[PDB]
Design a protein around this ligand. Structure first.
Ligand SMILES: [Mg+2]
Ligand SMILES: [Mg+2]
Ligand SMILES: [Mg+2]
Ligand SMILES: [Mg+2]
Ligand SMILES: [Mg+2]
Ligand SMILES: [Mg+2]
Ligand SMILES: [Mg+2]
Ligand SMILES: [Mg+2]
Lengths: 194, 194, 194, 194
């Protein structure tokens, strides 16, 4: 009846630039580039997110396909001498996976997990989410998510090439949270049936 | 002839506190306790070192013994309101080792490797040194070493309970190295004969 | 017959920037620009000193000449949001003087006095020195000085366009000293014949 | 009709301690004692003001009397190692005065000026106020005032031992000023008839 059902996850920083840090050792002032954008599902391959993942369940084919990416990190360093210098790196995508795919008569389930650190500052703990998602042949979905409290998170489902539907969003700046929340374990969780 | 020769290794931050890192938006300021001392052989069991290691070759017993230890890590956080909060942790010694001991006619060979990470940040990079030493029955040594460019490293020999003798010292505030030098590979090497 | 003889005084900050001061009221970090150099006699008119003075006694003309100058003060302010601002000002030279010139049979005496404020930091007490110098007709000098403990002080002589010769240097990081030494009385003193 | 008319002025810091400043050269966090009070005309002799002044015009003897005082300054310095150390001094009252008394049948005018340094810091900017007050025989007054934008300022009038009345107040924290407003010129001014 319904053929293709896609789940999209995005992790992004809304600001142009992260919170400024100063190292008295070097005299520098450093910040990393953001994604300069609000919430939206239309940001694929746009490089306006730190982590991006899409799983596509294909019932016609009896297949799960996954797509995983990380944005580019740019650090802006202002030297004592005043000069500014940018450096570029890209997080690994080794730990953005789609795992534990299990089939039954009327659907499939799997877990999506993402862990990506900042390639240019190693002292930083990685962002993490994991969702346990169950999809039925009818089209409706059933998700159990956890994620670090920072930065912003957005999840959408899109079925048979139609319009996108909001699964769940987390807005750190509405929530009181900060980059501290990236350490520890995954502070938040949610349940959602669409 | 000569019976006991000891090799001492010591890594230390000569300041009372590491140079401050500050988070501009919050005003928060972060520092790590140092060892507040200069170069000195007599620092054993004093907890004035990040890493501390002694290898004792005993020609009279045909034996090699070793001691290894880490200092305590203290994170001091100053809040915008001048409130101060401390945290304590102790790096594991699991990777301060004396390995590849080879006994032959002329004396003995072995390699001392130290690698200690920050018990308060799992993600920080570790300090590293490796020493390849060769000790002769007459009390000559031959040393080939590598180490990170930060913080301070000092190495000493002492024979038959005699005075200490400097093998090698490295002082990051002379070579202009930084806390960054704790990552990557070991960036200095040396060779010394006593 | 020795013709002309020179005394050069230089007060400079060896670092590129003085050490940060932070205000939890405004959230800001402030530093002033240093002179980014080591001790050297060849620094005239390079603007690489906070205060600089040359007294020249001419035995051919029987005259004393003096040059005096201050470098430029540059204040750098980092803001909570990582913006940086510079301001700029130049200390008055009115209080860098050469004084009480007395001539006798065998040479000349005089007094070099320096006092300079920070034009951007009124909170700054002046840097201060005074040299009492006695120059014999044959190119010998007898100097007696006082100075504040911070920053660095260098004094040289130069006879008849010859090489420069060190009279006295003060290095504040060697003698464990602080910008506090700027206030109060002149902390240090010396006498030298050369 | 009216015999005694008192004008009272108080300069105070509402909070227990001024906002901390940190110095990276020494690691010290340093804040000064405030007056830990809100606005109140009843604070004479209470040592809960930096500056206090009362002028009393006495229409019965035809005399103007004046009383001037500064508070105790106390700096708390927290050392990098935890230990705290207090110094105390007391600002001079040499520049809190009442001058330019001119009498006529109608009443009297005079000027009240206050300037007071921080007595541990010679070169710190004084707090300043200057009031031009006209006192009429019927008891009414007319005041043109100027003051620095920090810290807090309260002025009151009292006739024939009656209750106090507010002339004017300045709360630097409603108006978003800072300790910088201490410097340069008196940023605020006001005019009052009551
Ligand atoms: Mg995490
Ligand atoms: Mg967490
Ligand atoms: Mg290295
Ligand atoms: Mg390393
Ligand atoms: Mg001085
Ligand atoms: Mg002094
Ligand atoms: Mg003022
Ligand atoms: Mg002002």
């Amino acid at each position: 009846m319904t053929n293709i059902i896609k789940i999209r996850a995005s992790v992004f920083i809304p600001m142009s630039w992260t919170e400024a840090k100063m190292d008295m050792e070097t005299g520098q002032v450093i910040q990393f580039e953001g994604d300069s954008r609000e919430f939206t599902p239309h940001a694929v391959n746009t490089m306006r997110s730190r982590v991006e993942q899409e799983v596509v369940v294909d019932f016609y084919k009896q297949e799960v396909f996954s797509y995983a990416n990380t944005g580019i990190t740019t650090e802006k360093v202002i030297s004592p001498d005043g000069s500014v210098n940018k450096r570029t790196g890209k997080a690994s995508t080794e730990n953005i996976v789609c795992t534990d795919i299990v089939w039954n008569s009327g659907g499939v389930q799997f877990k999506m997990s993402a862990s990506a650190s900042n390639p240019l500052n190693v002292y930083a703990p990685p962002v993490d989410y994991v969702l346990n998602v169950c999809v039925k042949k009818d089209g409706s979905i059933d998700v159990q998510g956890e994620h670090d409290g920072f930065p912003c998170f957005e999840f959408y489902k899109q079925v048979d090439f139609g319009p996108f539907e909001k699964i769940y969003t987390h807005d750190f700046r509405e929530t009181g949270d900060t980059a501290a929340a990236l350490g520890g374990n995954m502070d938040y969780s949610f349940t959602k049936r669409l």
